[PDB]
């Protein structure tokens, strides 16, 4: 059980690392700092769609 817990702790640290290091050019995505961002997909202003990363 201790060995399994050690491997589980390693995987948990890997999960935290994946959350904290995934980025798009330097803009973090999966650590919660990326709140709702509006992508402008229209030819005129005010035609944006919100995307939320948790």
């Amino acid at each position: 059980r201790v060995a399994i817990q050690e491997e589980i702790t390693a995987l948990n640290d890997e999960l935290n690392r994946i959350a904290e290091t995934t980025s798009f050019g330097g803009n973090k995505l999966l650590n919660g700092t990326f709140s709702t961002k509006s992508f402008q997909i229209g030819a005129d202003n005010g035609e944006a769609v919100m995307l939320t990363l948790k």
């Binding site: 803009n27 992508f39 202003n45 944006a48």
Partner: protein
């Protein structure tokens, strides 16, 4: 005869006025082109994928 001479002066003045209008309109055409470029830049900047640097 004085009417004819005045008419020649009138067509000369009208040509000068058309020249001034053409020059102003070409300048404003370049202004329109620059405005369209700025509008494209503003539309690009409004996207949520951009960070502060872009």
């Amino acid at each position: 005869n004085v009417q004819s001479r005045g008419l020649d002066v009138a067509v000369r003045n009208a040509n000068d006025g058309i020249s001034i209008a053409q020059t102003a309109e070409g300048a404003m055409n370049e202004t329109t082109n620059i405005l369209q470029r700025m509008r494209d830049l503003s539309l690009q900047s409004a996207n949520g994928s951009n960070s502060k640097s872009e």
